[PDB]
Design a protein around this ligand. Structure first.
Ligand SMILES: Nc1ncnc2c1ncn2[C@@H]1O[C@H](COP(=O)(O)CP(=O)(O)OP(=O)(O)O)[C@@H](O)[C@H]1O
Ligand SMILES: N#Cc1ccc(CSc2nc3c(=O)[nH]c(N)nc3[nH]2)c(F)c1
Ligand SMILES: [Ca+2]
Ligand SMILES: [Ca+2]
Ligand SMILES: [Ca+2]
Ligand SMILES: [Ca+2]
Ligand SMILES: [Cl-]
Ligand SMILES: [Cl-]
Length: 159
């Protein structure tokens, strides 16, 4: 088994409902168990700002799936919760499940890049992660606590 850390976002179609439904679906992933769920945070949108605020959260998922098999399931869950691809870059969505980390693994396949390429720059990923995994060390040895101590991130508010 490995512990994967999954970021959750939603800003459409009742985010609290979407995220609660997603937690139920994440539990139903085979070869996998949720270990820890963060608080839910209400975050202003980064990138395009002409969209509703996000509900962001993080989950620790123990799994024996292959990394791309986990991606298969997270993509399925997003699609089954009505995620629709629009042309605009970084538009709003009913559900977004980003695989932040997959153990200590560095993965670079056609479909999957882990660690998530920008997570170390995103408070809405790092703060819920720290809530559930304060002792976390990245594959490159960087400590989560040190990033959050040293770098300026805006304070997050709970949902
Ligand atoms: N760590 C990861 N977690 C989830 N999907 C990933 C991934 N690494 C690569 N992908 C790929 O990312 C593709 C595009 O996903 P999108 O959800 O449209 C990007 P986004 O989440 O809106 O932006 P972001 O990656 O800047 O957070 C997926 O189809 C998937 O194949
Ligand atoms: N500068 C910036 C910047 C640009 C694009 C993205 C990726 S699109 C996106 N996803 C979320 C989310 O989950 N939460 C919140 N708050 N804002 C979001 N924006 C980004 F993150 C930051
Ligand atoms: Ca827009
Ligand atoms: Ca994302
Ligand atoms: Ca995504
Ligand atoms: Ca190739
Ligand atoms: Cl959507
Ligand atoms: Cl890393």
């Amino acid at each position: 088994m490995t512990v994967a850390y999954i970021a959750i976002g939603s800003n459409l179609a009742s985010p609290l409902e979407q995220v609660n439904a997603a937690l139920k679906a994440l539990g139903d992933i085979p070869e996998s168990h949720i270990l820890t769920v963060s608080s839910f945070y209400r975050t202003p949108p980064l990138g395009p700002q002409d969209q509703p605020d996000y509900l962001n959260a993080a989950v620790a998922l123990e799994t024996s799936l292959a990394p791309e098999e986990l991606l298969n399931h997270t993509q399925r869950i997003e699609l089954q919760q009505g995620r629709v691809r629009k042309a605009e870059r970084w538009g709003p969505r009913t559900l977004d499940l980003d695989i932040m980390l997959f153990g200590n693994e560095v993965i670079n396949t056609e479909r999957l890049t882990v660690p998530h390429y920008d997570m170390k720059n995103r408070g809405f990923m790092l703060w819920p992660l720290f809530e559930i995994a304060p002792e976390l060390v990245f594959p490159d040895g960087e400590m989560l606590r040190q990033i959050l101590h040293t770098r300026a991130f805006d304070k997050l508010n709970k949902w």
